[PDB]
Amino acid sequence: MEAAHSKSTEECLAYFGVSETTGLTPDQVKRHLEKYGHNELPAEEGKSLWELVIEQFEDLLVRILLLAACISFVLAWFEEGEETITAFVEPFVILLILIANAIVGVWQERNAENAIEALKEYEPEMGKVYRADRKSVQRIKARDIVPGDIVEVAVGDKVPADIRILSIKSTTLRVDQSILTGESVSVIKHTEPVPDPRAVNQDKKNMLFSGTNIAAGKALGIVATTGVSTEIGKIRDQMAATEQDKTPLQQKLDEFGEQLSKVISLICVAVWLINIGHFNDPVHGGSWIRGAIYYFKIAVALAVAAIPEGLPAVITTCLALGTRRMAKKNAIVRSLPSVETLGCTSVICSDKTGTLTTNQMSVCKMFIIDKVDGDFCSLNEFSITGSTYAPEGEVLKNDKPIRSGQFDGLVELATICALCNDSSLDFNETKGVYEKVGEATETALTTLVEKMNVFNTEVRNLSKVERANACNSVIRQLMKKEFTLEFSRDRKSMSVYCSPAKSSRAAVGNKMFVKGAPEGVIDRCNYVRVGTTRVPMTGPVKEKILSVIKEWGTGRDTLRCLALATRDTPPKREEMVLDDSSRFMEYETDLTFVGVVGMLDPPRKEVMGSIQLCRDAGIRVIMITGDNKGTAIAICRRIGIFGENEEVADRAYTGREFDDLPLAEQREACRRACCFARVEPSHKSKIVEYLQSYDEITAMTGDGVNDAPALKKAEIGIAMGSGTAVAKTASEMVLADDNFSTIVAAVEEGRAIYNNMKQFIRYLISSNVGEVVCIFLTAALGLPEALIPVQLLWVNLVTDGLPATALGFNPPDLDIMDRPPRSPKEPLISGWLFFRYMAIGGYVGAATVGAAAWWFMYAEDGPGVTYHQLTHFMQCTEDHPHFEGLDCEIFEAPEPMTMALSVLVTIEMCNALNSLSENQSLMRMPPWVNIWLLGSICLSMSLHFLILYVDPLPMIFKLKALDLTQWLMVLKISLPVIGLDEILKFIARNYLEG
Template sequence: MNEEQKWFSKDAGDVLKELDTEKSQGLSEEEAKRRLEHYGKNELPEEDKEPLLKKVAKHFNDVLIYVLLAAAVITGILGHYIDTAVIAVVAIVNAAIGYFQENKAEKALAGIKKMLSLFANVRRDGDRTEVAATDVVVGDIVLLNAGDKVPADVRLLKAENLNVEESPLTGESTTVEKHTYALDSETVLADRKNMAFSGTSIASGSGVGIVTATGEDTEIGKINQSIAEVEDLQTPLIKQTSQFGKMVAIAIVGFSVLMYIFGLLFRDYPLGELLLYVIGIAVAAIPEGLPAILSIILAIGVQNMAGRNAIVRNLPSVETLGSVSIIGSDKTGTLTKNEMTVTSVVTSEREYDVSGTGYVPEGDILYKDEVVRTEEDPTLKDLLLSVKTCNDASLKKDEEGRWDIKGDPTEGCLLTLAAKADIPVASPDVEAKIPFDSSYKYMATLVDATEEKVIYIKGAPDRIFDMVDQEGFKKPKWEQLMKTHAKKGERVIGVAMKKVSKETTSIDHGDLDDGVMFLGLVGIVDPPREEAMAAVKACNQAGIQVKMITGDHVDTASAIGYQLGIGDGRHALEGKEIDTMSDDELVKAANEYDVFARTTPQHKLRLVQAFQQNDKTCAMTGDGVNDAPALKRADVGVAMGIKGTEVAKEASEMVLVDDNFKTIVNAVEEGRRVYDNLKKTILFILPTNAAEAFLITAAIFLGIMMPLTPVQILWVNMVSSVTVSLALAFEQLDKGAMTRPPRPPNTPLLSGYYIFRIIFVALLIGGGTLAMNLSMIDQGYDQAIVNTVTLNTIVITQMFHLFNCRSELEFAFNKDFFSNKAVFVVSGLLILLQLFITYVPFMNTIFETEPLQAGYWLFPIIMGAIVFIVVEIEKVITKQVVNNKRYKRKEGST
């Protein structure tokens, strides 16, 4: 009912009338009960939970798994139970991995619920009453005090120095001062200062308001609904592997059927034996170990990221970071410190710079890069005394040794400024005070100085300018200075003083009508993180665009963005402009602009969708509730761990433990390493799988005994391949990985060169092994010996080929040859396993192998060395061809 109403644009009296409530009486208990029954409780709706059995079953919904399960059933019918068991285990392990990667929507919604208030103070039948927040209804008169959580969306009727902490909802870095008068109907969420929103908290002051929305109709409820409605996107890697799996499954099944028909028509194998051989082809060709290897590579990436202060909550997201081409980042607390800092002080004599950031009182007041002697500038000394005295905040270290402020952040940074002076600034007693109020926009204190009493004043510069009664004061000059600093992204505070007689014991507004002397201006910013600047530069070098999406004012956002290297400091798109754009127009604007200001949660979500419409793989960073829908929609949502809300964390794929934007660059680096190592793994596994399938296919064509049995093939695939290829997960980042552009989302998993390399190596290994097999049979070797030598040849050539695959085109024996110790560890383990299957009696029985004399090991070793040398020669030739093509393209472009 109330979702479409713009209560902020109506007079308070009209709101009371429309909602049929009296300010002094509130609702009656009877009316409140009736409305509660009509509109429902003030809580967010629960999502229907998926049954456990369905959650598990859907992870078997994969084409490759179907083929494997079919093979398991057939081998079981034929009595080959070992084959059946191993294939079934592969399918179950794959499903288990998928189950534990279940999406996090339920947790995200639960995180929002934790933000909501438990109790509320309302006025019912004229009495103040505490009720459960879930029982608050539209029309209730709510009483708000410092420390309270706002229980619902409220149109304020009374606001006494009321300041509300809204940064989790709107992204604002400072508390928002509230008032009660009506606003323009087009006012954006962050500027609705006559409203208090559910889930925010009262920082100071008190107020009274009327509830205009509850439950899912509140602003936080709309965000909750946005999260629930956002469709989970598949990561680029999952899309690629899914498409790859379907292609491989269709090809394998089709080829196996053709081979079965060929065997029936042209060979005299028994039907059961022929079926087993065809299953052998399928099992040999299917890279059933790939899902497990993929998960292991991603898990190692997750572990590495944890060591670099990033917690990855979804395995495939590690790789997705490597393909990110655009990062949409919140400003406050992400690119900036979310700690107000004085950066400049302007007096009539000089303009000073202030070093240091945040609330830590470390830094100096500088003039021309020299530390200022405060005693030499009486005006500066008075200004520092003014901002320290005319102040209600406190600054102290917490139990963990971090500097923290209690009170308004703006006043806190003024205390830090005073602490940066070269000499201690005095702390005289305050005898009287005019508290700050939005109606007059300043604060004043009466202080007893040594020889006289002084009224110190600070506030909005325009109000201070109007008070000044001082010879030589040039208002236009100071107004221009104020505008200059505001364009730099600074929030400007005016400071003044007035000397009064020693008999003065109290002050009021009339005491400031004359005799006020202007002291200067103080420029305050929420400073950019130093490490964020370096991270933005690194992103640009890696071909990644960084877009700032903030709820802050456009001038501040543009100025801070320019300092960070985002945008040109002049052009920015505001939320109200986004509202007027169609989706197609926004797609174009999203590409043109780098800074987006005064944005709402819906704007952020639309921008993420616009980036994706531009074929960008998008990461979105943020820390507030307002970021949650966009975090969930993005290809990778990145939440801040220290200052981030639980809602943001649960809606994201990655959490930065240190809130450091640079950690995102580390994550991109790790993502690119993971993807490169995955491709190396595929380059290793597929040729060996294809070589095994080639052996059996050739045997059917030639009408000879099978070189390998299905159970021997499973040994090779599930033990040898998984063990050896695991080593590639530990390969270091390739040179130049962070200077190449991100790969396009539609990049196929297998490039043309990879397909060539797979076929080339498969024929090399398969053809060479088959030739050796036939030669041994012609020489009269026992079939069991031949099969055992063939099995060991396939495995040992894989081990040699592993060293080929450590680099796509670089020479294997380079300076990084010993950098990955895992390669040598798994090679040693592989040799032990082959000795185990060759010489242990019960393994001979299960896998139909025979113990070999030492001389037989020359066959696999020589074959492995030949494969290694030939592939290295091919890499040298291919690298030369690639370099020639690049040179020609470069020459053509010039």
């Protein structure tokens, strides 16, 4: 599979040893097929549900829960039947929870979509070849196409492989290579070789790329490469080779579990030690077996107590909402987890024209040579109005409107803009707007024509659907467009050969109209036109021409300049080979300068401002365009990337410059650069690598398969709403409106979503900290179970869930975009915050245990050993006549449990309020700042009473409380929390960080 673009048509045929008129022989096919394999991309890897669930159960916590569920399930079968009945609820609930998550991962992933899978939508099922075993073309499955056999394609055919073109049967071959780039503008292909072996696809003018479509023509080619070796094929490899890290929250979360696990086992260790006496005092007795059940059933309590079971749901319900939210702001986010990382974007690389600008061109300045005499030179600058492609505006000289016709040089400038253009205008009725037909910079040139109808032809007496191509059409009737030498990046220009209409303008007859980048065309001009006369180009006139060119493109105008010229006596037709592009530059020489035109691709209104917020936000911004660097810089200044007088030398690079650099300085340039002029194929992927070495969260934009690898490697690939489907599938976010401003807005909701997200996480996680202390003490003391897994569970999923997801709606700080982007390594809980929940938790742990124990001691509804003998409640039915003297089952009393729980519940609806703000007291940040937070608390409270007052729930979750004494007890136990926190919160004034 050679690199055919540089080799001749004969070279490639010889290489594979194939006959153009015969094709590969059955042997050749067999051989080639074995060596290069089948012409397709490797199959997809969508591992089964079994492999899914297995992963849905690969989390260290989900495991710990599974184990716990088992122990509970095992215990749920160990005691006499009837009275126990509910002891199948504990294991059943846990499992549901787990199972439910497993049910999520399955439906979750199953509806996803690999960007690689999308590529296969580009593989045509069939192709057409010429093989030795027949004379007429064979229509075989693309899959079986091989390097070396002759392929034939025509209009509408999807190119089956990377084909070197041998001969074009039609009069012209045009191809839509958009799926690579996105530009729908078909491209003309040729047959002669392309010298440079390191040429970028865009210049492989004799090549057909697997995946592209044939816009016009029919051609014959020899397959150069196939499968994974094809251009789109190389890309698939890059995209598969690329690995993407976990969201920093997912990182921090996994870490939490990695530690949550060690502590748990550590506790077990400690507990075992606190009750190590059972080795030197327990005389072999019967009850010495009902003790293991204690440790086991307390282990499951320890487990559901340590895990934030509801957290997963709170987070996704939060992100999903934030998602639908960002959507209204035109930011389509794919993959919820991205919302976070988006909030942390350090750098944003944005393509210019589509998103930073509008891609709505319009000529603002023209200029023709007015006078050349000696060193004395005089131009004829003009100005034009009208931003739309709408034929509405006027040409002015010194702000004074003018009749274009009164100028000769202009009538020409006009003819050229009209003839050497493959675009047109069109007026639609649906939305009564004038729409661009061809390419933006051309469709503009036509607009320039209408607005300056040189001949003064009557148009106002015409409808809109004709007013569009009125003056343009007239010019097309004074000259005949024989053929056109298309544009190519070598000569950076284009011409059209023309002959007049007999006896109407046959003065000189055949003319050649060329437009293109100034530098090239001007050098190729030996004469300048001054009206109807011509004069030899001279040093001064040239200098003047250029100077105004640099002003217009370098100055504040930031305009794209097209030099315009004609070849007065073009070569004779018979002397031109119109099918091999290299000779075009030669055919476009000895030209006569007839004037340049400047156009503008206006920055988007909101851009100027958005660029600013990023500055406030400490988010660097990098422009990636196709403009010559000079103009690149100018534009960067016009929008604020750079300061009108800021030094940029070291901050702007052209793709070529960047290449001449060694990996070293190449990385430097990246941490400092803000502008990249003419970026070649791989630059986006490299720049993203460097920005990553400096640990920067970067955002790239792009829309073709060409950019998929970069969009995949970037932390947040950003696709255009109007871009390709492969780009979209490669990106985490899609800009419905293609607007840069949408990116920034998004970054913002990001930062907001996370801030709230950060608190409800802290809220839940801390509770779990305290729940555990309860379970620890309950065991360390030997005291009867203060809280049960089932209760805990309900709490962590429901009672605490609702206020958690309500905190999700906390109002946004006001300086969110004035603070630098959050460091990914920034932990959720540390230092003094660790200390606080360190305390709060400890508090709820004592408050919860004490409360339940209280009902046992000092309570007027079932008193107990105020001497702390309850500690041996295990020993009751044994030595009943010991110190008991009462019912040996009060230890299984429901009230004492509904006590410690109602005290937790409240302590949580309380701690939930302490979480509205990390450091601001409630007298500063009152609870009514989040009506939802209050509304939810009510919903949890009534829900709490639902498990007490109902009748079936009571059996599983105990019997109710007395409201005046039992409940008030609860309050004087919980309510104090708010104080404890406000106290530790106030400690923020004794420190220096606010």
